[PDB]
Design a protein around this ligand. Sequence first.
Ligand code: SAM
Ligand code: SF4
Ligand code: SF4
Ligand code: SF4
Ligand code: CA
Length: 418
Amino acid sequence: MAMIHKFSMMGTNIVVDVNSGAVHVVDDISFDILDYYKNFTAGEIKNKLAHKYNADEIDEALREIESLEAEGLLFSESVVKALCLHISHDCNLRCKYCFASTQRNMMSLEVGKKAIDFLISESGNRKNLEIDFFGGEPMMNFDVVKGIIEYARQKEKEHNKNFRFTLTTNGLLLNDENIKYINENMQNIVLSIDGRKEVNDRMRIRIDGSGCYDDILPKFKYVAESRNQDNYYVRGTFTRENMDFSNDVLHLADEGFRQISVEPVVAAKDSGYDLREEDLPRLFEEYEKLAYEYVKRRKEGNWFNFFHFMITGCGSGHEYLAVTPEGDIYPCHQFVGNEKFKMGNVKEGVLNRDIQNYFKNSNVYTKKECDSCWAKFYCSGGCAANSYNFHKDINTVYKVGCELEKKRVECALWIKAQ
Ligand SMILES: C[S@@+](CC[C@H](N)C(=O)[O-])C[C@H]1O[C@@H](n2cnc3c(N)ncnc32)[C@H](O)[C@@H]1O
Ligand code: SF4
Ligand code: SF4
Ligand code: SF4
Ligand SMILES: [Ca+2]
């Protein structure tokens, strides 16, 4: 499986050798060489490239590319650590693209602590433990969150562990007092806002239809600077309704957000919101359009971090598990619908292993469609929710949500070239 990927993006030619991880910026002549190198002689390539370059400059271009091959940078040849807590399945929003379009109960405190104990028991001897407060809207049940935190740190002393708490909130229930507590206790907070106001208020709406932009932007802007524009990010979701998502990222940057994350929709088949292949040469340009601007404001007064350019696996189902409010264990937040992937309850606290191993053995070596790919050692490993939603199987590639990430890998590699 000796292969390379070749791309040229905004006046530069970069090459990736997949097994090595080596990255090369190359000139036009050696860039056109690799169209023929592995299958043609040095004598055959002269007659081929005898309209743009001449024999000597061709051979010198062969010289080093044949030495990178000789150097070996061309053609080279389970323990659970995090729990996604569903502190609530109720919510005060009705976002179109969200799975919570279906009941409505609150995680009890006794199920929370049975979630902390389950994590410690299955953590092996890993010291760093992650607890994500998620679900519907966790702040609707903030009493329990404070109780789970105060309970975990009593356990940190006894079990030689360390808990890393993150919250993800729609914004509506942040106030002066819970924003204090959030910054002396949560290591990271995720703010859900979709960017421009017409885009956000289009779909992050309440039961009545009214939006949430005007209410969350004031408190989001502040939580960011209360924590010095770090240890947070604003989390946006672009669907078919806003494929110009670059302005969404930059509008959030213009409002003073250094840490921004904008991602495609997951498990959005047959909703009208998912992105199709026809949109791929539409979504690509704004990724490139984005990667250009981050370099443009890299060292200037303005600057912003886009999470998907910052360069294992995602871990859902073997290293990362979601806990329903009743204690039920699921591979991730996106699977608590499907009952077949039910893996146990944190009360009884014993984990189903062969669903766990079924998920652990779904990596870039396992699936046949990945072994052909150039970004296998650069990828997230895919999204199991997207695979089962588009093909009812955890181990077949979801072609769109995949060429998106390959372009982000291409955009992240390209930023580091400057
Ligand atoms: C599921 S919500 C739960 C936490 C909290 N209520 C909030 O929105 O911040 C967390 C994040 O997941 C994202 N999300 C919801 N449904 C999604 C979907 N179908 N595809 C991709 N992201 C989604 C939303 O953008 C939201 O920011
Ligand atoms: S707020 Fe979070 S949970 Fe409620 S709908 Fe919007 S995304 Fe789903
Ligand atoms: S990108 Fe999709 S296909 Fe290429 S490796 Fe990562 S997951 Fe497998
Ligand atoms: S499966 Fe898809 S959605 Fe569930 S965690 Fe891994 S990536 Fe996020
Ligand atoms: Ca700690």
